[PDB]
Amino acid sequence: ITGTSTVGVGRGVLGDQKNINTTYSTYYYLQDNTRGDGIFTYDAKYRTTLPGSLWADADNQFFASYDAPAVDAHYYAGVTYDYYKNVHNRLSYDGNNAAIRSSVHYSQGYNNAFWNGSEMVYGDGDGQTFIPLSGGIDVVAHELTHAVTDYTAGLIYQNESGAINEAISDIFGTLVEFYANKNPDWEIGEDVYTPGISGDSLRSMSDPAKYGDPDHYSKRYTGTQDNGGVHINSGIINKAAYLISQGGTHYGVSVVGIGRDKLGKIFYRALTQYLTPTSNFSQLRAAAVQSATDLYGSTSQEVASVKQAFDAVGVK
Numbered sequence: 414i415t416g417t418s419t420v421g422v423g424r425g426v427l428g429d430q431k432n433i434n435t436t437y438s439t440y441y442y443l444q445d446n447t448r449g450d451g452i453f454t455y456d457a458k459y460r461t462t463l464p465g466s467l468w469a470d471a472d473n474q475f476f477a478s479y480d481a482p483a484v485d486a487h488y489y490a491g492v493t494y495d496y497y498k499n500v501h502n503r504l505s506y507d508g509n510n511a512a513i514r515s516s517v518h519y520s521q522g523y524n525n526a527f528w529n530g531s532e533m534v535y536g537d538g539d540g541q542t543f544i545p546l547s548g549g550i551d552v553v554a555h556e557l558t559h560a561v562t563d564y565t566a567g568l569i570y571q572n573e574s575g576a577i578n579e580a581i582s583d584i585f586g587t588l589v590e591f592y593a594n595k596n597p598d599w600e601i602g603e604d605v606y607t608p609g610i611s612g613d614s615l616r617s618m619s620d621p622a623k624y625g626d627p628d629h630y631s632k633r634y635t636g637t638q639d640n641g642g643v644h645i646n647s648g649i650i651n652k653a654a655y656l657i658s659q660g661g662t663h664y665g666v667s668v669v670g671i672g673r674d675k676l677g678k679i680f681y682r683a684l685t686q687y688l689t690p691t692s693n694f695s696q697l698r699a700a701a702v703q704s705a706t707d708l709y710g711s712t713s714q715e716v717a718s719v720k721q722a723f724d725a726v727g728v729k
């Protein structure tokens with residue numbers, strides 16, 4: 414759309430009030446012109462046909478309960494752009510300020526969200542397993558980081574390379590959650606998952622085993638489901654990345670933490686310089702040690718904490 418950039422106010426999935434960047438041209442659109450080539454949010458109207466319609470509002474006020482998932486997807490996609498730009502110097506997911514598209518209200522009671530190769534897509538949840546999935550900032554950034562991986566390492570979505578694909582989306586989803594300072598933790602999907610039960614979440618980085626996922630390489634899943642367990646085996650990498658950041662003794666191996674800024678920037682470098690579409694866990698260990706070397710020196714503590722974390726998880 415061509416029009417005048419302006420600012421609206423809305424309420425998100427969790428009832429919080431926020432200002433969002435809109436574009437005025439007879440209606441007010443969910444089009445944000447201030448970031449790259451724009452951030453566009455679309456109404457999928459409970460269908461499965463994408464993208465849907467670009468979101469149009471009469472008065473630039475987004476307080477209807479139908480509005481909520483659109484306010485959050487549009488807002489959080491903004492924060493995520495800002496994290497990659499400000500922290501890593503990356504302009505959009507392609508590095509060239511590509512436009513960022515999301516659709517909300519996809520299907521009926523659809524308990525998932527995904528990146529389809531061109532766009533992000535958010536279910537509303539059935540009301541009991543989930544509530545509308547864009548209400549989670551770690552969920553939004555997990556999704557946007559899949560676009561980042563696609564343009565860079567290209568990690569094939571199956572077996573080990575797939576699980577590394579998933580861990581990368583969890584890791585940067587959490588770093589965006591700490592970036593925004595929005596009640597941040599080392600869990601995934603907590604703000605949106607099971608509104609009935611308090612204190613849980615989809616996956617844990619700090620203790621994957623809490624939900625039954627492997628936290629050590631010998632406990633790797635080897636069958637066939639979940640594309641060879643891409644959402645399962647990512648537990649092993651998630652635990653490594655948690656240890657590098659925070660520190661700890663895990664299966665009797667001790668790791669000093671080097672914190673979350675260095676974590677992200679060892680991972681971002683591994684991702685953009687060293688990883689390839691078929692990389693396995695033990696190539697991720699080489700890439701991460703090589704990154705930390707580049708950045709901090711061969712006999713840094715940073716290099717040493719990377720080696721310990723991967724030993725602690727049985728990866729090499």
Ligand SMILES: CC(C)C[C@H](N[C@@H](CCc1ccccc1)C(=O)O)C(=O)N[C@@H](Cc1c[nH]c2ccccc12)C(=O)O
Nearest residue numbers: 524525526527528551552555556559579601602615644
């Ligand atoms: C970040 C998370 C909130 C949503 C996230 N969405 C997935 C994309 C999943 C997808 C793939 C193909 C076709 C449709 C959907 C991803 O980005 O890897 C996920 O981890 N999905 C898992 C876990 C999950 C989502 N919905 C579920 C329903 C029940 C139990 C677990 C789940 C899954 O697809 O397995």
Ligand SMILES: [Ca+2]
Nearest residue numbers: 470472474475
């Ligand atoms: Ca309105």
Ligand SMILES: [Ca+2]
Nearest residue numbers: 595596597598
């Ligand atoms: Ca949180």
Ligand SMILES: [Ca+2]
Nearest residue numbers: 551600601602
């Ligand atoms: Ca979280």
Ligand SMILES: [Ca+2]
Nearest residue numbers: 606607608610
């Ligand atoms: Ca819950």
Ligand SMILES: [Zn+2]
Nearest residue numbers: 555559579582
């Ligand atoms: Zn994913």
